[PDB]
Write a protein that binds this ligand. Structure first.
Ligand code: FMN
Ligand code: SF4
Ligand code: SF4
Lengths: 180, 430
């Protein structure tokens, strides 16, 4: 969470969220009159895993997303409505993309599953979609895993399966594998 | 009490009798002065009888509202739905011109406690809280001693005063805030949160302290009610005019020969009050620039209006002001009205809780504009802008502190625009 409290109109959406929904009860209106200010009176870091939702709840950009800081403007992004595989809730999300890059992930309204809230992991895991990515087929050799074409990898898999028979073939599915 | 002329209240007609502390303010003196006389009977007569007697007396509410006390008390629920009822006495007396409540708390503690008993029985409140200003440590000590004495003699508690009624009284104190005098903000403060007013569409009679039906009344109304039931509603009604019946405590302050707190019947002429009790204006009646009649919240009145103005609720409403509290402030020709009104604007900027947008922002805006006008930095159109901003604040806030911030500035614009224009032009000229 990035803070520009100078831009803060004193609604209480962040405080009400932190109390009723998040339940960490960290934010409050400290002060009286015009110099009243919003935030933890002590130096504290927001501990809830629903912390990202205050950014969306903030109408006037006083609370903003630090990972998504100064990177793009709203009009530049194409939004596609998809679901979050971070956990089995299947939170409905809108992925905003510029070109070939995912820029930010925000929730969608679905009273059935996620009212309008998104967990921090789902919200901020798009960063790991740009790192340690697999782009090409790799076949192992004496020099290690090396670049190979699709045909060569399939040939190696065929030569391997030829040896195995019956229950010697084993499949392990992952957390993010899809039904198809 | 004569319909033609009002004034010159006699000692026999004064409710608050040791207001000046010439006698023992504690229980021995209170009993010798007529306190706790026959409270058993008055309480035993039933809540309905008390409500009708208060309604017939015509007692309107001291503290600024002016709302009829009997009707407000009758809004309380008759039968419990599982929620107890509470009485909270607003002894928070924060108001820039008002000092009257402090004398009652320090010199007539037992009248207030007995009144709390009477009003709690009239409204069916099991428990009562006396909110006191945090600055009033000694006054709080006096009130607490009165409460302890009343508990000791059985005047309070179960079977209070010998009647089959149960009432417990507590003394609670704030930490200093003008906003905590408002009914809902006081309840929030006593609950334990910030003293920020609650939106009124839920009303305190419906839902109040701890979610239970409550009524907030001033110390003066609570203190005058028992003697109203003793002396008689007709006696209370005789003094004032129609719809404005009782006597009220007038605190004269400012540029007067003798600043005094005094009790007088309402509908006395302001000139008569100032000349008789205050000793006259410093330098004579000729030496008047303006007079703030009802504390700082209400608009000020110029000398010309102060000539024929009568000290009443409805009449001051007709004179584009109000008798919020009988806190009359007198200014000489020497006084700079601009600086005093700027100080009031600073007061309201300091006392805003900051909850709603119009008060939180416009009160600071008003203070800034008044500060520039105090030096002549502003233009001539700035006065019209100031009027427009005051209109913007009024009516669009959660509580009446926005209105109380707007009103003094509006009064200054309305009655002393000439002096502001003079100051603005001369600074440009010189
Ligand atoms: C900003 C603000 C401050 C107030 N301060 C006081 C106060 O100090 N004492 C008081 O009796 N009423 C104060 N009031 C008026 C409250 O509404 C008060 O609790 C209520 O009018 C009492 O009702 P009563 O006339 O029956 O006593 C204040 C109102 C506002 C808006
Ligand atoms: S939600 Fe945003 S604008 Fe509202 S109080 Fe919180 S930080 Fe300020
Ligand atoms: S008007 Fe002023 S004091 Fe009253 S609730 Fe609004 S901000 Fe607070």
């Amino acid at each position: 969470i990035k803070t520009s409290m100078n831009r803060c109109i004193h609604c209480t959406r962040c405080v009400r969220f932190t109390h009723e929904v998040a339940g960490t009860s960290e934010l409050g209106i400290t002060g009286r009159g015009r110099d009243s200010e919003v935030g933890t009176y002590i130096e504290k870091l927001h501990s809830s895993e629903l912390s990202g939702n205050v950014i969306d709840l903030c109408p006037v950009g006083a609370l903003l997303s630090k990972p998504y800081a100064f990177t793009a403007r709203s009009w530049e992004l194409k939004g596609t409505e998809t679901i979050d595989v971070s956990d089995a809730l299947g939170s409905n999300i809108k992925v905003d993309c510029r070109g070939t890059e995912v820029m930010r992930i925000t929730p969608r309204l679905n009273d059935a599953i996620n009212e309008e809230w998104l967990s921090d992991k789902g919200r901020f895991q798009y960063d790991g979609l740009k790192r340690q990515r697999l782009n090409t087929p790799l076949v192992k050799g004496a020099k290690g895993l090396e670049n190979a074409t699709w045909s060569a990898a399939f040939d190696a898999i065929r030569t391997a399966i030829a040896g195995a028979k019956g229950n010697e073939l084993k499949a392990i599915a992952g957390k993010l594998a899809d039904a198809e | 009490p004569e319909k033609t002329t009002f004034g010159g209240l006699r000692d026999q007609d004064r409710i608050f009798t040791n207001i000046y502390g010439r006698h023992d303010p504690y229980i021995k003196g209170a009993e010798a002065r007529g306190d706790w006389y026959m409270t058993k009977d008055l309480v035993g007569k039933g809540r309905d009888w008390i409500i009708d007697q208060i309604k017939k007396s015509g007692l309107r509410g001291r503290g600024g509202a002016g709302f009829a006390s009997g009707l407000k008390w009758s809004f309380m629920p008759k039968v419990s739905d599982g929620r107890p009822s509470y009485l909270v006495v607003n002894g928070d007396e924060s108001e820039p011109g008002t000092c009257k409540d402090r004398e009652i708390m320090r010199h007539e503690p037992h009248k207030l406690v007995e009144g709390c008993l009477v009003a709690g029985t009239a409204m069916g409140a099991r428990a009562g809280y006396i909110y006191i200003r945090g600055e009033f440590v000694n006054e709080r000590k006096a009130v607490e001693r009165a409460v302890a004495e009343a508990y000791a003699k059985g005047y309070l508690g179960k079977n209070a005063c010998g009647s089959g009624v149960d009432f417990d009284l507590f003394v609670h104190y704030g930490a200093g805030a003008y906003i905590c005098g408002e009914e809902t903000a006081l309840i929030e403060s006593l609950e334990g949160k910030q003293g920020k007013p609650r939106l009124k569409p839920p009303f305190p009679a419906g839902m109040g302290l701890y979610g239970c039906p409550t009524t907030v009344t001033n110390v003066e109304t609570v203190a005058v009610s028992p003697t109203i039931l003793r002396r008689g509603p007709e006696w209370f009604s005789s003094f004032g005019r129609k719809n404005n019946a009782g006597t009220k405590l007038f605190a004269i302050s400012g540029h007067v020969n003798r600043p005094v707190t005094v009790e007088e019947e309402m509908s006395i002429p302001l000139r008569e009050l100032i000349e008789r009790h205050a000793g006259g204006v410093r330098g004579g009646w000729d030496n008047l620039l303006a007079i703030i009649p009802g504390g700082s919240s209400v608009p000020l009145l110029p000398k010309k209006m102060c000539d024929d103005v009568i000290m009443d609720f409805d009449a001051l409403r007709t004179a584009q002001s109000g008798l919020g509290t009988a806190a009359v402030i007198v200014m000489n020709k020497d006084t700079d009205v601009i600086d005093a009104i700027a100080r009031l604007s600073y007061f309201y900027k300091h006392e805003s809780c900051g909850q709603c947008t119009p008060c939180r922002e416009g009160t600071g805006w008003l203070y800034d504009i008044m500060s520039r006008m105090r030096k002549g930095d502003a233009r001539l159109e700035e006065i019209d802008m100031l009027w427009e901003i005051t209109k913007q604040i009024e009516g669009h806030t959660i509580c009446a502190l926005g209105d109380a911030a707007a009103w003094p500035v509006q009064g200054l614009i309305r009655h002393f625009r000439s002096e502001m224009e003079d100051r603005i032009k001369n600074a440009d000229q010189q």
